[PDB]
Ligand binder design. Structure first.
Ligand SMILES: *[C]C1=C([C])[C]=C2C(=[C]1)N([C][C]([O])[C]([O])[C]([O])[C]OP([O])(=O)OP([O])(=O)O[C][C]1O[C](N3[C]=NC4=C3N=[C]N=C4[N])[C]([O])[C]1[O])C1=NC(=O)[N]C(=O)C1=N2C#C[C][N][C]1[C][C]C2=C1[C]=[C][C]=[C]2
Ligand SMILES: *[C]C1=C([C])[C]=C2C(=[C]1)N([C][C]([O])[C]([O])[C]([O])[C]OP([O])(=O)OP([O])(=O)O[C][C]1O[C](N3[C]=NC4=C3N=[C]N=C4[N])[C]([O])[C]1[O])C1=NC(=O)[N]C(=O)C1=N2C#C[C][N][C]1[C][C]C2=C1[C]=[C][C]=[C]2
Lengths: 499, 494
């Protein structure tokens, strides 16, 4: 009933906010719609898999907040398998390689690929992480889709196809669905192209032993009966001295402040009194989440390793249901498994099939890519289509269609009277991921602490010490990578020598 | 409590559905979130204006359903003033003209303008009204914004600027915000470029005497206590024999079927049990409404008429708060007024100002465009910013960003168990307008009648006889309009 702060949403962000406030001595309540905490993280446990992350899973260097929170809760990480060769499957053929990027041999295609990634990061440097709408060319970039940008930048189909796969994989959306400004911000605020795409030294380096769901679960353990499950919030009334928060199951909660720790668009599920300001009212109708099915196929052994394949496959082409896989085998070497994502339009298209039909398609794909009949012999299968989730809206995160980030972006984490906004979408570093969830939850909590006069203004945003367990190697480039011309750059160079 | 059909939303679509079901002998309840009916229509009454439409207002030829429904309810229309000259204000100068289209005199510009409008309609002919995702090039066109299309098609800045204004005015959204497929469908399903843009013989020909709000009000009068105001729906449960509909004010309604007559995205405000199917679950997060402030400045006299101006202004350029106006003077010739729309990003930008500040900006603009100091002497002002409305989400209607219509469009009016979908967004003719609201409400009602075995399948969709009061003249083109080359066409010929 009565408390200091109501946190709407018991995902990592809401739980991190609640924990910080609780630790500070405030009385907090977490109102969670589902019969579980964790939200876009979910760790299934059964005898066949032991445990498996069906939602958010990967953590890595530079994600120091999630690493610190998890460590404090008694969790450990392990390294995703990248010992053996990666595979790039292009035009029906597999090409093994090493390093974050698939190598390209054609001199022209090489220049084009090199220029694409370089330009993505170049453009990124012009975009403030905490205010992407302040980029010098914000409007120009926001008024273009990523498809238009790729069409302009890529002088080869090879680069365009790989860039497209990259976008689909990064933000579970099609290149024509998303703003170029927003996508460029998204990559930059994850530390750039190399950091976001890498397993070793990147966002996919590690997973939590026992699953990421433990983060939210262990915070719930700490908070006890303060977490209220199956309490979807339907109504927030700020017309009186204390904020009134009502749930679907007919309960009323009274608080000094509220943290909204749900995906921005899911704010639509709440009726507000007084109405939201115009900009937020419209913003929450303009910000969809992406589409993805996370699929894990289990095998007797990690047979790919015997062929000097680590389990990573970058698979291009419309026919492939999954465009990207990672080895999901336990650190102990058992429960051998391949994790694959079915992305964007394919999540929509293939949702029509049965679980068994999807398993068959994945195994047949993997058999071809790995050149291994063993891939046709799965022992178990688990999957989760996040598009079906009423209380998520999709995964991994919210994307911005053209024109929206510049017009409505500044509204995202602007308080509405006594409502403050958490959720990974409001983060400024690794927004979209578990790291961003922690950053945003703790920042929102500290905004309330400041509002109560408990901390100074300069303590709202707090730096995080680097993990000792997961140190970050710097992202480096070669002289040639920095200075090799683009394709049009080479053509202009030829033109001047001709003239 | 218990009834045959619960209609969620008491706008024109919900009211039209409820009326049809009521007339058929079913027990209906309308659950309306606001303290009023009408939704995206709202007629304000006061001494200063008598009445004024602050939402949907215009009707015209080919909109036979809204005209028939209004007539039955005892309403009449009158013609929007288009006797005198229209004005196109370009690069700081006013150019008076007659006919629906502002003329162009540069020959290359003429070819470009002609080709643009022609191509819009050409493309439209390949788009099925009831299934735009079935267009032969549906994916190609859906994966482009209108901005990209205009960039490809328009070889002149003049054409591109006017095309942009057209998009902004049509769908209260920026060219880069919207799918080309969806926009081309939108225009085509309103009868094409000429029909949608025209006052005389088009969508802006007429208004209702006394206001369009009377449509929803008079149906509420007919239905009596069946309409429940300040009942926002929060929860729909379909797990049991009868559908359970719960409201915010703690009431429970039980019905055999439900009609959702709210903007698609506002379905998000309802918690569903069981959850919605995947495609609808995501669809309702992908479909925003546009942004507009409707502004009416009142004057002592319709002074523009004295200068042989009808009051229609098409105003190019970023600086102008309002890109389009119409004379809003009463049929009697009193309550002289100019109606203007503040569109898309300008609605966002100018919302920051006070009502008085917007009035000043509009009056100064009108003084410039009309070349009249009389425009600086308003006697009254009314405005409505639809972006602020929790239970609308915007106006005039829902737009589809690139990629959405092809991926999710088929979901729009697909029933979910015992929930059927009305609302202007689900119409196949004049979707977005009051006409579409009536079409969709009556179709949704008839889907339920068919589900109950009361009517055959072929009666779900019903043709509408042409209004005798507002007959439609055909849209015609000249030989030269049809056959003159585009700019690249002329270049290839050279
Ligand atoms: C789903 C997913 C997947 C499948 C995957 C992934 C993910 C996801 N991610 C993301 C994560 O998960 C996120 O971010 C997080 O989790 C978030 O958090 P937050 O913010 O907290 O949120 P949430 O969870 O959602 O929560 C919320 C809550 O609330 C609630 N509600 C609602 N509504 C309501 C409520 N309550 C009350 N009332 C009302 N009304 C709900 O229920 C919930 O609970 C991720 N992340 C990370 O970190 N990691 C990972 O891994 C992930 N994932 C993914 C990834 C991928 N990656 C890839 C690979 C390769 C590559 C890539 C990318 C790029 C490049 C390369
Ligand atoms: C806003 C607006 C404006 C400003 C303008 C306009 C408009 C609008 N429009 C549109 C109309 O209005 C519409 O369409 C209608 O109205 C719709 O209907 P419906 O479908 O029925 O829907 P609504 O109204 O929205 O209703 C709904 C209801 O529901 C409710 N809710 C919500 N949620 C809920 C509820 N309930 C319970 N629960 C829950 N949860 C609400 O409240 C409501 O009530 C229009 N239209 C027509 O027809 N006309 C006109 O005029 C209009 N407007 C406009 C126009 C413009 N035009 C222009 C000029 C020149 C040109 C143009 C265009 C193109 C070319 C040229």
């Amino acid at each position: 009933n009565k408390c200091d702060v109501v946190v709407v949403g018991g995902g990592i962000s809401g739980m991190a906010a609640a924990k910080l406030l609780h630790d500070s001595g405030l009385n907090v309540v977490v109102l969670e719609a589902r019969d579980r905490v964790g939200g876009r993280t979910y760790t299934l446990r059964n005898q066949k898999v032991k445990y498996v992350d069906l939602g958010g899973s990967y953590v890595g260097p530079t994600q120091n907040r999630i690493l610190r929170l998890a460590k404090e809760l008694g969790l450990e990480t392990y390294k995703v398998n990248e010992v053996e060769r990666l595979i790039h499957h292009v035009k029906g053929k597999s090409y093994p390689f090493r390093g974050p990027f698939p190598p390209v041999w054609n001199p022209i295609t090489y220049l084009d690929h090199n220029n694409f990634w370089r330009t993505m990061d170049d453009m990124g440097r012009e975009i403030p992480s905490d205010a992407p709408w302040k980029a010098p060319l914000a409007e120009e970039w926001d008024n273009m889709t990523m498809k238009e940008l790729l069409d302009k930048l890529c002088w080869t189909e090879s680069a365009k196809q790989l860039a497209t796969l990259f976008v689909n994989l990064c933000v579970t959306a099609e290149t024509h669905e998303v703003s170029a400004l927003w996508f460029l911000w998204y990559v930059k605020q994850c530390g750039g192209t190399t950091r976001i795409i890498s397993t070793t030294n990147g966002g996919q380096e590690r997973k939590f032993v026992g699953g990421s769901g433990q983060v939210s679960e262990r915070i719930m353990d700490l908070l006890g009966d303060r977490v209220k499950l199956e309490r979807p919030v339907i109504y927030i009334d700020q017309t009186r001295e204390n904020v009134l928060v009502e749930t679907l199951n007919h309960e009323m909660y009274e608080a000094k402040y509220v943290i909204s720790a749900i995906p921005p668009t899911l704010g639509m599920k709440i009726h507000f009194n007084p109405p939201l300001p115009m900009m937020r009212n419209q913003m929450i109708t303009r910000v969809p989440l992406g589409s993805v099915i996370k699929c894990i196929v289990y095998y007797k052994e990690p047979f790919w390793r015997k062929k000097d394949y680590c389990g990573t496959m970058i698979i291009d082409g419309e026919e492939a249901p999954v465009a990207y896989t990672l080895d999901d085998t336990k650190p102990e070497g058992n429960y051998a498994a391949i994790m694959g994502f079915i992305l964007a339009h394919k999540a929509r298209k293939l949702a029509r099939l049965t679980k068994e039909e999807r398993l068959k398609k994945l195994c047949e794909l993997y058999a071809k890519v790995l050149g291994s009949l063993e891939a046709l012999e799965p022992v178990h299968y688990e999957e989760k289509n996040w598009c079906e989730e009423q209380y998520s809206g999709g995964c991994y995160t919210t994307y911005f269609p053209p024109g929206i980030l510049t017009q409505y972006g500044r509204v995202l984490r602007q308080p509405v009277d006594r409502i403050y906004f958490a959720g990974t979408e409001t983060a400024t570093h690794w927004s979209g991921l578990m790291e961003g969830a922690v950053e945003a939850g703790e920042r929102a909590a500290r905004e309330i602490l400041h509002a109560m006069g408990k901390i100074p203004e300069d303590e709202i945003w707090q730096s995080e010490p680097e993990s000792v367990d997961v140190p970050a190697q710097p992202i480096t480039t070669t002289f040639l990578e920095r200075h090799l011309p683009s394709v049009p750059g080479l053509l202009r160079l030829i033109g001047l020598t001709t003239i």
